[PDB]
Amino acid sequence: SHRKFSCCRKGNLGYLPRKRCTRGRGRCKTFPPDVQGAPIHLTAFLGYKAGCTHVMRFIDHRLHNRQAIDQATIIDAPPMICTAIIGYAKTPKGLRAVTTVWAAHIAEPAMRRFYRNYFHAEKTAFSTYMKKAADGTYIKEQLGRLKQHADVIRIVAHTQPALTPLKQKKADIMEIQVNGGANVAEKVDYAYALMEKPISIKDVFSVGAQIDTISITRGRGFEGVVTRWGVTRLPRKTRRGNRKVACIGAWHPANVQYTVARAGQMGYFHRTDTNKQVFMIDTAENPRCCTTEFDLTDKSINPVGGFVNYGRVQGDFIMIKGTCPGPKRRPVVMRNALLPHRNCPPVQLQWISTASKFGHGIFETVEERRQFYA
Amino acid sequence: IGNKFRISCGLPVGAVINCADNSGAKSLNMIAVKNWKGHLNRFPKASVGDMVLITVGRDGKPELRRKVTPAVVVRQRKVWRRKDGVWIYFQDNAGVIINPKGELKGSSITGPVAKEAADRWPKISTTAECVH
Amino acid sequence: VIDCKGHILGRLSAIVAKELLHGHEVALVRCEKAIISGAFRDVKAHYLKKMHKRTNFNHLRGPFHFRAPAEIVRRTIRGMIPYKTVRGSDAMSRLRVYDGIPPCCARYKRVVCPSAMAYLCLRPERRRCEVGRVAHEIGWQHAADVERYEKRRLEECDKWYQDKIQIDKKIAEAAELQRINAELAKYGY
RNA sequence: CUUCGAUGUCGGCUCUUCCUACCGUCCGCGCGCACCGGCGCGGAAGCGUCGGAUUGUUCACCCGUUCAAGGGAUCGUGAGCUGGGUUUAGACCGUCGUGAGACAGGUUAGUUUUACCCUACUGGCCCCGGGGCCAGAGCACGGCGGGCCAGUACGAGAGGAACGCCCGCCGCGGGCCGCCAGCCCCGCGGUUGCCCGGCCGGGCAGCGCCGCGCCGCCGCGCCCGGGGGCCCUGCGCUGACCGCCUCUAAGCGCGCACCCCGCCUCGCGCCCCGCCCGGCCGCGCGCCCCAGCCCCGUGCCCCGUCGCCGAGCGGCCCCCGCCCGGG
């Protein structure tokens, strides 16, 4: 029969299969295009998401010259060291690598990655490589092979977890493209000059641009269609219960279709939010990061109470307007956006929230609490 | 007039609201909301500053009863977030009778009136004694 | 090793299907330059019509429709083989299809099937579309790469040509009995 | 014709796909097309096709609104439901029959049983490093406005556009907690009966109840959705067959909410590095064009048949723990 009244499919078929992500941390799977002739930039950074804030801003779009409060998420970012250079050629088959020159000296956080348990491990990783390199005659010669045969150069870098409050104690290695540059050599030289050296969010991204947060979303376990896809609860008098999709198909096709609503794993799946602006790029060592000329006192990213379910962010922090995928401390990757909103508002922040997210706080800084309570 | 910024849709169809203007009547019952296209089952919902069709109730003035009229809700009980982040919730649900061209039937609007209604409908702004 | 520049996608797949089943094993190269007879718009819509055939219940159990041209030539040779039976499974495996001449099969001596070539088959003005162009409009995103590579290969083979005549002219110059018997002794071979 | 050792039978709800003989929006074209608006086409299924009064009602009709096409899937959909209806047994009423009873005449009352099997679908699992990349499969932004244009074109007036850019809303989709809602696992305060001899402080009434409430979900809150390619109907350009003409015949331009790819979700396998760096196997390249086809219409024709060294180019195997705590 014709359905009768008309309504749309509940759920996005392109976001199937809904399984816990096999990829441990978000893999970009894409990078902004090279545009040979642009300044040689870098296109990504890894950070552990902190907590949301709510900042006043001055809006100049067309509400012009008015002030609005909007949530911003602090993605704590540690300087991430660079460990290697990967040159992938663009052969018929796809991006195929032409070898990688890992660095001679690699730290414990990144060494921790290869072995599951460090204390009881062979600790043999890169024993021969360190020996064959070190002189650096070999490293250079192989970087030369990348320049001669490669078209896309990506610098593999490791985030130092000790600087973050994360409990991992092992670095999550990542690949960042060095896109831009007149030729492959300039990109290769840019990668060589950043090798075994900290890379900071300040260099990779800028305030006012939009970047895409990629990550793994929060998860709920098995959840029924009502809380997974969104189908309407059946009316109160239903035997076998109301929280379900009443018809899973029609006698033909006999097999149930893939487009039907089915109970499964809600959450913990890879998602890329897009076009989120960078309200603030700063280092928490400075004690006036939240101090604005319309603040008139001293504040910093750490909120009284601490980021709830998070640490201290005693490091560089990127504040991105809007919610990003992931619970606190989930690794959140960031890429230069691929196609941002054509007409966005300019960013001027006139006040940043610092009171305790824990409970309800009416005291922006620690000192005000002891003076108010006397 | 202008471009509406989304608020919280406080009042669904069947809501009875009080009448701010004198020439209107004590009960004004929502019947439909203007510019409403929704998915199935959604009861058309209106909010402060939208044009909603109202019917004067049995308690109301006999002359204006038994007809469907345009109206804009002035006071909405449900909390809504203005951009500056203030959430303002009015004490009671109420609305004014306006012709679609903005003509309020009553001589004066009585009771504090929402900022959102004033911007969208100009005449309400001139006749509102205590804008909040 | 049958090169497929100019060969009909149906007729090559008849010569090659008999060979695989006879048990010969062949490699097809330059596959994108093979021609599917007919006007491009109709040929493109016959494939963009085949790509609509898919199992409604799960497009994963559905017929797999392949966009890259090496597969388009081989799925055709799959119909002309008993793919399900073992003697067919051995022969489909015995076919290696390469879009463009890869370094894997480049040095191999190359033969072409003259009979199934569109030049010797289709009349002039029949209108023919290369599977490579159909591939790009059905969803192949690797077209430029296989043309950049093929140019660079045809360039190193142009330098080689100058080198090759030199080695084989010396061989011929040193012609110092089979030549006067195998093709010349009441044999004429 | 198939089913009567039984295919659950009406509609509704919930949900999924499909079809064009397309109502609105997309692209043209024709008007008895000045403008607004209407009306007729051809391509077109992408999206939208609502909220309600009566009725069991499919239908019908009316009232609204962003003004509201038609159908199909065992009259899709009962081990999904609901039983209002129909359709058992109780009971009326009207008519018909001498009567038992009848009624395609109305009225009320009247168990909706069973998956733990197999498929299918959805998620999950089967000890082996990290970092990537492809084949395949899913595939998502439409629609409505306000602003400037503009009171301009057009019009005798009356009325009254548009491309473009901006700003919003609706529908849906993916997220998130600060804000503000909602919630409270054992927190803090209040109180009521009883039991602890009274105070203090506790129990018991399946959390006795009440007032707030934290981490956390969550929504009613916020955040994000701006791109390419062939082309369809056609509109044209040069230019014929056919001393003209011409959109088409050879060409050639432009070109659709469609389509295909991107983004995006999944991803068998594969690549690189590390550990180790080991074995095995093969022996072989000019290109281009067919109305110049430049010498055509050959060659190989012996993968064991006596071939197998190497060199050099490919391949091919090749390799990597858990338990245990916490999230």
PDB file of N, CA and C (backbone and C1' of nucleotides) in Angstrom, chain D residues 212-243:
ATOM      1  P     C D 212      12.746  21.870  44.999  1.00  0.00           P
ATOM      2  O5'   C D 212      13.980  22.794  44.613  1.00  0.00           O
ATOM      3  C5'   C D 212      15.221  22.204  44.208  1.00  0.00           C
ATOM      4  C4'   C D 212      16.325  22.591  45.158  1.00  0.00           C
ATOM      5  C3'   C D 212      17.696  22.074  44.763  1.00  0.00           C
ATOM      6  O3'   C D 212      18.351  22.997  43.897  1.00  0.00           O
ATOM      7  C1'   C D 212      17.253  21.416  46.979  1.00  0.00           C
ATOM      8  P     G D 213      18.746  22.551  42.408  1.00  0.00           P
ATOM      9  O5'   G D 213      19.887  21.441  42.620  1.00  0.00           O
ATOM     10  C5'   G D 213      21.230  21.891  42.894  1.00  0.00           C
ATOM     11  C4'   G D 213      22.002  20.774  43.547  1.00  0.00           C
ATOM     12  C3'   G D 213      22.456  19.639  42.631  1.00  0.00           C
ATOM     13  O3'   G D 213      23.629  20.012  41.929  1.00  0.00           O
ATOM     14  C1'   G D 213      21.655  18.786  44.703  1.00  0.00           C
ATOM     15  P     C D 214      23.730  19.737  40.373  1.00  0.00           P
ATOM     16  O5'   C D 214      25.301  19.741  40.130  1.00  0.00           O
ATOM     17  C5'   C D 214      26.176  20.255  41.143  1.00  0.00           C
ATOM     18  C4'   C D 214      27.074  19.161  41.655  1.00  0.00           C
ATOM     19  C3'   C D 214      27.518  18.142  40.623  1.00  0.00           C
ATOM     20  O3'   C D 214      28.577  18.642  39.826  1.00  0.00           O
ATOM     21  C1'   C D 214      26.989  17.078  42.689  1.00  0.00           C
ATOM     22  P     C D 215      28.432  18.636  38.246  1.00  0.00           P
ATOM     23  O5'   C D 215      29.198  17.307  37.823  1.00  0.00           O
ATOM     24  C5'   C D 215      30.551  17.072  38.241  1.00  0.00           C
ATOM     25  C4'   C D 215      30.906  15.625  38.025  1.00  0.00           C
ATOM     26  C3'   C D 215      30.427  15.034  36.711  1.00  0.00           C
ATOM     27  O3'   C D 215      31.323  15.292  35.640  1.00  0.00           O
ATOM     28  C1'   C D 215      29.851  13.578  38.479  1.00  0.00           C
ATOM     29  P     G D 216      30.743  15.694  34.210  1.00  0.00           P
ATOM     30  O5'   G D 216      29.655  14.554  33.901  1.00  0.00           O
ATOM     31  C5'   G D 216      30.105  13.314  33.311  1.00  0.00           C
ATOM     32  C4'   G D 216      29.014  12.280  33.441  1.00  0.00           C
ATOM     33  C3'   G D 216      27.865  12.387  32.439  1.00  0.00           C
ATOM     34  O3'   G D 216      28.206  11.765  31.207  1.00  0.00           O
ATOM     35  C1'   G D 216      27.000  12.073  34.621  1.00  0.00           C
ATOM     36  P     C D 217      28.240  12.617  29.859  1.00  0.00           P
ATOM     37  O5'   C D 217      27.420  11.704  28.851  1.00  0.00           O
ATOM     38  C5'   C D 217      26.094  12.079  28.463  1.00  0.00           C
ATOM     39  C4'   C D 217      25.097  11.039  28.909  1.00  0.00           C
ATOM     40  C3'   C D 217      23.680  11.278  28.410  1.00  0.00           C
ATOM     41  O3'   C D 217      23.459  10.462  27.270  1.00  0.00           O
ATOM     42  C1'   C D 217      23.688  11.194  30.781  1.00  0.00           C
ATOM     43  P     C D 218      23.394  11.122  25.825  1.00  0.00           P
ATOM     44  O5'   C D 218      22.179  12.137  25.950  1.00  0.00           O
ATOM     45  C5'   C D 218      20.833  11.689  25.746  1.00  0.00           C
ATOM     46  C4'   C D 218      19.912  12.478  26.633  1.00  0.00           C
ATOM     47  C3'   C D 218      19.455  13.808  26.067  1.00  0.00           C
ATOM     48  O3'   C D 218      18.236  13.600  25.371  1.00  0.00           O
ATOM     49  C1'   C D 218      20.137  14.066  28.328  1.00  0.00           C
ATOM     50  P     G D 219      18.053  13.997  23.806  1.00  0.00           P
ATOM     51  O5'   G D 219      16.591  14.662  23.691  1.00  0.00           O
ATOM     52  C5'   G D 219      15.830  14.875  24.905  1.00  0.00           C
ATOM     53  C4'   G D 219      15.439  16.327  25.034  1.00  0.00           C
ATOM     54  C3'   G D 219      15.459  17.176  23.752  1.00  0.00           C
ATOM     55  O3'   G D 219      14.369  18.088  23.769  1.00  0.00           O
ATOM     56  C1'   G D 219      16.696  18.235  25.402  1.00  0.00           C
ATOM     57  P     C D 220      13.449  18.276  22.477  1.00  0.00           P
ATOM     58  O5'   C D 220      12.391  19.368  22.949  1.00  0.00           O
ATOM     59  C5'   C D 220      12.263  20.630  22.271  1.00  0.00           C
ATOM     60  C4'   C D 220      12.683  21.770  23.168  1.00  0.00           C
ATOM     61  C3'   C D 220      14.188  22.045  23.220  1.00  0.00           C
ATOM     62  O3'   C D 220      14.480  23.424  23.047  1.00  0.00           O
ATOM     63  C1'   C D 220      13.306  21.892  25.401  1.00  0.00           C
ATOM     64  P     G D 221      15.474  23.936  21.881  1.00  0.00           P
ATOM     65  O5'   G D 221      16.802  24.389  22.667  1.00  0.00           O
ATOM     66  C5'   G D 221      16.718  25.506  23.581  1.00  0.00           C
ATOM     67  C4'   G D 221      18.083  25.770  24.167  1.00  0.00           C
ATOM     68  C3'   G D 221      19.260  25.690  23.191  1.00  0.00           C
ATOM     69  O3'   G D 221      19.503  26.955  22.596  1.00  0.00           O
ATOM     70  C1'   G D 221      19.701  24.325  25.061  1.00  0.00           C
ATOM     71  P     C D 222      19.536  27.095  21.010  1.00  0.00           P
ATOM     72  O5'   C D 222      21.094  27.080  20.685  1.00  0.00           O
ATOM     73  C5'   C D 222      22.002  27.915  21.422  1.00  0.00           C
ATOM     74  C4'   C D 222      23.321  27.210  21.604  1.00  0.00           C
ATOM     75  C3'   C D 222      24.025  26.805  20.321  1.00  0.00           C
ATOM     76  O3'   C D 222      24.838  27.865  19.834  1.00  0.00           O
ATOM     77  C1'   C D 222      24.074  25.016  21.886  1.00  0.00           C
ATOM     78  P     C D 223      24.849  28.210  18.278  1.00  0.00           P
ATOM     79  O5'   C D 223      25.946  27.216  17.695  1.00  0.00           O
ATOM     80  C5'   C D 223      27.263  27.158  18.266  1.00  0.00           C
ATOM     81  C4'   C D 223      27.984  25.927  17.780  1.00  0.00           C
ATOM     82  C3'   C D 223      27.807  25.597  16.310  1.00  0.00           C
ATOM     83  O3'   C D 223      28.707  26.347  15.512  1.00  0.00           O
ATOM     84  C1'   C D 223      27.625  23.625  17.608  1.00  0.00           C
ATOM     85  P     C D 224      28.199  27.010  14.161  1.00  0.00           P
ATOM     86  O5'   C D 224      28.404  25.849  13.093  1.00  0.00           O
ATOM     87  C5'   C D 224      29.715  25.550  12.593  1.00  0.00           C
ATOM     88  C4'   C D 224      29.764  24.123  12.114  1.00  0.00           C
ATOM     89  C3'   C D 224      28.986  23.841  10.843  1.00  0.00           C
ATOM     90  O3'   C D 224      29.744  24.206   9.693  1.00  0.00           O
ATOM     91  C1'   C D 224      28.547  22.154  12.445  1.00  0.00           C
ATOM     92  P     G D 225      29.042  24.942   8.440  1.00  0.00           P
ATOM     93  O5'   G D 225      28.369  23.749   7.608  1.00  0.00           O
ATOM     94  C5'   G D 225      29.222  22.730   7.039  1.00  0.00           C
ATOM     95  C4'   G D 225      28.351  21.627   6.497  1.00  0.00           C
ATOM     96  C3'   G D 225      27.624  21.944   5.182  1.00  0.00           C
ATOM     97  O3'   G D 225      28.115  21.136   4.116  1.00  0.00           O
ATOM     98  C1'   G D 225      26.148  20.940   6.789  1.00  0.00           C
ATOM     99  P     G D 226      29.096  21.738   2.965  1.00  0.00           P
ATOM    100  O5'   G D 226      28.096  22.505   1.956  1.00  0.00           O
ATOM    101  C5'   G D 226      27.987  23.948   2.050  1.00  0.00           C
ATOM    102  C4'   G D 226      28.135  24.568   0.682  1.00  0.00           C
ATOM    103  C3'   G D 226      29.562  24.669   0.143  1.00  0.00           C
ATOM    104  O3'   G D 226      29.495  25.013  -1.232  1.00  0.00           O
ATOM    105  C1'   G D 226      28.832  26.800   0.688  1.00  0.00           C
ATOM    106  P     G D 227      29.941  23.993  -2.411  1.00  0.00           P
ATOM    107  O5'   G D 227      31.460  24.424  -2.748  1.00  0.00           O
ATOM    108  C5'   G D 227      32.556  23.607  -2.267  1.00  0.00           C
ATOM    109  C4'   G D 227      33.129  22.801  -3.408  1.00  0.00           C
ATOM    110  C3'   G D 227      32.660  23.199  -4.822  1.00  0.00           C
ATOM    111  O3'   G D 227      33.689  23.225  -5.804  1.00  0.00           O
ATOM    112  C1'   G D 227      32.340  20.905  -4.469  1.00  0.00           C
ATOM    113  P     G D 228      33.551  24.165  -7.109  1.00  0.00           P
ATOM    114  O5'   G D 228      34.282  23.326  -8.272  1.00  0.00           O
ATOM    115  C5'   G D 228      33.474  22.532  -9.172  1.00  0.00           C
ATOM    116  C4'   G D 228      34.130  21.188  -9.361  1.00  0.00           C
ATOM    117  C3'   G D 228      33.797  20.444 -10.656  1.00  0.00           C
ATOM    118  O3'   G D 228      34.603  20.870 -11.749  1.00  0.00           O
ATOM    119  C1'   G D 228      33.598  18.973  -8.828  1.00  0.00           C
ATOM    120  P     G D 229      34.007  20.998 -13.253  1.00  0.00           P
ATOM    121  O5'   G D 229      33.747  19.480 -13.718  1.00  0.00           O
ATOM    122  C5'   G D 229      34.882  18.674 -14.106  1.00  0.00           C
ATOM    123  C4'   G D 229      34.409  17.275 -14.398  1.00  0.00           C
ATOM    124  C3'   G D 229      33.392  17.141 -15.532  1.00  0.00           C
ATOM    125  O3'   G D 229      34.046  17.069 -16.793  1.00  0.00           O
ATOM    126  C1'   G D 229      32.653  15.918 -13.657  1.00  0.00           C
ATOM    127  P     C D 230      33.448  17.798 -18.107  1.00  0.00           P
ATOM    128  O5'   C D 230      32.271  16.836 -18.578  1.00  0.00           O
ATOM    129  C5'   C D 230      32.518  15.838 -19.578  1.00  0.00           C
ATOM    130  C4'   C D 230      31.644  14.635 -19.340  1.00  0.00           C
ATOM    131  C3'   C D 230      30.358  14.602 -20.135  1.00  0.00           C
ATOM    132  O3'   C D 230      30.598  14.180 -21.467  1.00  0.00           O
ATOM    133  C1'   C D 230      29.928  13.958 -17.902  1.00  0.00           C
ATOM    134  P     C D 231      29.952  14.943 -22.752  1.00  0.00           P
ATOM    135  O5'   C D 231      28.604  14.140 -23.002  1.00  0.00           O
ATOM    136  C5'   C D 231      27.371  14.853 -23.118  1.00  0.00           C
ATOM    137  C4'   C D 231      26.408  14.386 -22.062  1.00  0.00           C
ATOM    138  C3'   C D 231      25.013  14.952 -22.195  1.00  0.00           C
ATOM    139  O3'   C D 231      24.308  14.178 -23.167  1.00  0.00           O
ATOM    140  C1'   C D 231      25.719  15.106 -19.943  1.00  0.00           C
ATOM    141  P     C D 232      23.232  14.845 -24.225  1.00  0.00           P
ATOM    142  O5'   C D 232      21.796  14.551 -23.607  1.00  0.00           O
ATOM    143  C5'   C D 232      21.603  13.406 -22.763  1.00  0.00           C
ATOM    144  C4'   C D 232      20.276  13.484 -22.070  1.00  0.00           C
ATOM    145  C3'   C D 232      19.249  14.366 -22.749  1.00  0.00           C
ATOM    146  O3'   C D 232      18.599  13.659 -23.809  1.00  0.00           O
ATOM    147  C1'   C D 232      19.267  14.801 -20.418  1.00  0.00           C
ATOM    148  P     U D 233      18.302  14.351 -25.256  1.00  0.00           P
ATOM    149  O5'   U D 233      17.074  15.327 -24.983  1.00  0.00           O
ATOM    150  C5'   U D 233      15.763  14.804 -24.713  1.00  0.00           C
ATOM    151  C4'   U D 233      14.947  15.837 -23.984  1.00  0.00           C
ATOM    152  C3'   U D 233      14.693  17.119 -24.755  1.00  0.00           C
ATOM    153  O3'   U D 233      13.606  17.001 -25.664  1.00  0.00           O
ATOM    154  C1'   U D 233      15.401  17.637 -22.555  1.00  0.00           C
ATOM    155  P     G D 234      13.800  17.276 -27.269  1.00  0.00           P
ATOM    156  O5'   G D 234      15.015  18.348 -27.421  1.00  0.00           O
ATOM    157  C5'   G D 234      14.717  19.696 -27.858  1.00  0.00           C
ATOM    158  C4'   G D 234      15.099  20.674 -26.776  1.00  0.00           C
ATOM    159  C3'   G D 234      15.743  21.982 -27.237  1.00  0.00           C
ATOM    160  O3'   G D 234      14.757  22.937 -27.606  1.00  0.00           O
ATOM    161  C1'   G D 234      16.945  21.077 -25.392  1.00  0.00           C
ATOM    162  P     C D 235      14.935  23.800 -28.939  1.00  0.00           P
ATOM    163  O5'   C D 235      15.955  24.939 -28.504  1.00  0.00           O
ATOM    164  C5'   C D 235      15.545  25.995 -27.622  1.00  0.00           C
ATOM    165  C4'   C D 235      16.740  26.820 -27.219  1.00  0.00           C
ATOM    166  C3'   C D 235      17.562  27.366 -28.372  1.00  0.00           C
ATOM    167  O3'   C D 235      17.043  28.582 -28.900  1.00  0.00           O
ATOM    168  C1'   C D 235      18.999  26.370 -26.775  1.00  0.00           C
ATOM    169  P     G D 236      17.115  28.924 -30.492  1.00  0.00           P
ATOM    170  O5'   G D 236      18.618  29.434 -30.720  1.00  0.00           O
ATOM    171  C5'   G D 236      19.500  28.680 -31.587  1.00  0.00           C
ATOM    172  C4'   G D 236      20.912  28.912 -31.117  1.00  0.00           C
ATOM    173  C3'   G D 236      22.029  28.808 -32.157  1.00  0.00           C
ATOM    174  O3'   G D 236      22.207  30.011 -32.892  1.00  0.00           O
ATOM    175  C1'   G D 236      22.631  27.617 -30.216  1.00  0.00           C
ATOM    176  P     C D 237      22.639  30.011 -34.465  1.00  0.00           P
ATOM    177  O5'   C D 237      24.183  29.624 -34.440  1.00  0.00           O
ATOM    178  C5'   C D 237      25.164  30.549 -33.950  1.00  0.00           C
ATOM    179  C4'   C D 237      26.509  29.876 -33.918  1.00  0.00           C
ATOM    180  C3'   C D 237      27.035  29.459 -35.277  1.00  0.00           C
ATOM    181  O3'   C D 237      27.694  30.552 -35.896  1.00  0.00           O
ATOM    182  C1'   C D 237      27.291  27.679 -33.726  1.00  0.00           C
ATOM    183  P     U D 238      27.385  30.927 -37.419  1.00  0.00           P
ATOM    184  O5'   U D 238      28.774  30.656 -38.141  1.00  0.00           O
ATOM    185  C5'   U D 238      28.806  29.959 -39.392  1.00  0.00           C
ATOM    186  C4'   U D 238      29.811  28.836 -39.345  1.00  0.00           C
ATOM    187  C3'   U D 238      29.681  27.826 -40.469  1.00  0.00           C
ATOM    188  O3'   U D 238      30.360  28.238 -41.644  1.00  0.00           O
ATOM    189  C1'   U D 238      29.785  26.672 -38.419  1.00  0.00           C
ATOM    190  P     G D 239      29.572  28.402 -43.056  1.00  0.00           P
ATOM    191  O5'   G D 239      29.201  26.896 -43.504  1.00  0.00           O
ATOM    192  C5'   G D 239      30.267  25.943 -43.731  1.00  0.00           C
ATOM    193  C4'   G D 239      29.676  24.558 -43.696  1.00  0.00           C
ATOM    194  C3'   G D 239      28.470  24.342 -44.609  1.00  0.00           C
ATOM    195  O3'   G D 239      28.835  24.029 -45.946  1.00  0.00           O
ATOM    196  C1'   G D 239      27.998  23.499 -42.444  1.00  0.00           C
ATOM    197  P     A D 240      27.961  24.597 -47.149  1.00  0.00           P
ATOM    198  O5'   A D 240      26.558  23.876 -46.937  1.00  0.00           O
ATOM    199  C5'   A D 240      26.007  23.000 -47.936  1.00  0.00           C
ATOM    200  C4'   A D 240      26.399  21.568 -47.664  1.00  0.00           C
ATOM    201  C3'   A D 240      25.481  20.513 -48.262  1.00  0.00           C
ATOM    202  O3'   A D 240      25.862  20.211 -49.596  1.00  0.00           O
ATOM    203  C1'   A D 240      25.960  19.960 -46.016  1.00  0.00           C
ATOM    204  P     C D 241      24.797  20.318 -50.772  1.00  0.00           P
ATOM    205  O5'   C D 241      24.319  18.811 -50.974  1.00  0.00           O
ATOM    206  C5'   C D 241      25.253  17.717 -50.984  1.00  0.00           C
ATOM    207  C4'   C D 241      24.620  16.499 -50.356  1.00  0.00           C
ATOM    208  C3'   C D 241      23.278  16.090 -50.935  1.00  0.00           C
ATOM    209  O3'   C D 241      23.489  15.256 -52.075  1.00  0.00           O
ATOM    210  C1'   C D 241      23.186  16.052 -48.561  1.00  0.00           C
ATOM    211  P     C D 242      22.607  15.399 -53.433  1.00  0.00           P
ATOM    212  O5'   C D 242      22.523  16.971 -53.703  1.00  0.00           O
ATOM    213  C5'   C D 242      21.600  17.505 -54.666  1.00  0.00           C
ATOM    214  C4'   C D 242      20.680  18.532 -54.042  1.00  0.00           C
ATOM    215  C3'   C D 242      21.338  19.695 -53.298  1.00  0.00           C
ATOM    216  O3'   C D 242      20.822  20.913 -53.825  1.00  0.00           O
ATOM    217  C1'   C D 242      19.560  18.795 -52.029  1.00  0.00           C
ATOM    218  P     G D 243      21.714  22.271 -53.865  1.00  0.00           P
ATOM    219  O5'   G D 243      21.221  23.032 -55.193  1.00  0.00           O
ATOM    220  C5'   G D 243      22.191  23.288 -56.244  1.00  0.00           C
ATOM    221  C4'   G D 243      22.847  24.632 -56.028  1.00  0.00           C
ATOM    222  C3'   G D 243      21.943  25.749 -55.502  1.00  0.00           C
ATOM    223  O3'   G D 243      22.688  26.807 -54.905  1.00  0.00           O
ATOM    224  C1'   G D 243      22.385  26.064 -57.819  1.00  0.00           C
TER     225        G D 243
END
